[PDB]
Structure 1
Amino acid sequence: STDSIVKASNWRLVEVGRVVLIKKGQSAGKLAAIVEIIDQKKVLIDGPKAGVPRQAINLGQVVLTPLTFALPRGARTATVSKKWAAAAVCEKWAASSWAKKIAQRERRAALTDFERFQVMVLRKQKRYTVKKALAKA
């Protein structure tokens, strides 16, 4: 109890070695990481992994992510690659619930009509089971 209550508000922080999800550009939904910081707006992003070319960017175009790793000051392409897989951020990312969502609507987009009909009949059955089982107590 004598431990203080001051807390917490832990947010995402610009810093070297932070994977950012680029939301508009030729990337448009990929990952990169922050090599190094220019100023309150402009930064320098890249990863050779997901293909994003290394470039300046104005933070408007790009959303941070919970995920980061460790990385030198002003690293380079090859480096950021080696550290990248070294950190296994792709696994980590895709494991998350977030990336599950992006992948989700991505696929729901691709549903062929007939597929979508499958989805109808199934959800009818599954629904019916949950309703059966529930409301018995």
Structure 2
Amino acid sequence: PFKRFVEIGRVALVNYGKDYGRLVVIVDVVDQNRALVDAPDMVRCQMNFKRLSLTDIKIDIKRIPKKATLIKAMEEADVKTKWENSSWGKKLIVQKKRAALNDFDRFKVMLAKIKRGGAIRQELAKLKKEVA
């Protein structure tokens, strides 16, 4: 049993190149290596499976569908929202946000996390001693 296939509709992260991070809909297959990928911000183009990491979101669309219907199906399957709330899709967003922290923000994060460490230390001690 396989849990993720290349088929018309499925959205994939683009996991390599100048264009890391973009989500693209596989609207057609060129051959066993290359695919047609389309996006709301980017014009349909060929792009290689080795540069595509498939995701778990699929959308019910035509073959090489018109741009309007591709958009309407993308919000019909709420791909950007579902990606963002996905743990995988949240991984990339959180790494960009951690990339965006400056020094004062990083110091506030350090202070916020030291108290959390002390808190979980206190709590773990109490609960371990509670469990007799």
What is the TM-score with the length of structure 1 in the denominator?
0.85
SS at match of 1:135: helix
* Identical counterparts, % of pairs: 37
Alpha-carbon offset, residue 94 of structure 1: 0.9
Verify the 8 A CA contact 1:30 1:52 in the aligned structure 2.
no
For residues 28 and 128 of structure 1, the distance between their equivalents in structure 2, rounded to whole angstroms, comes to 37
Offset of 1:83 from its aligned partner?
A: 1.2
The yes-or-no answer on 1:75 pairing with 2:97 is: no
The correspondence of residues 80-119 of structure 1 with structure 2, limited to 5 A, is 80-119=70-109
Q: 1:26, CA displacement in angstroms? A: 4.7
Paired residues for 1:20-39 under 5 Å: 20-39=12-31
| Contiguous gaps of at least 5 residues in structure 1 | 1-8
Task: Show the 5 A alignment for 1:21-60.
Answer: 21-48=13-40, 51-60=41-50
Q: How many corresponding residue pairs?
A: 127
Partner of 1:4: none
Higher helix fraction (1 or 2)? 2
- Helix, strand or coil: the match of 2:90? helix
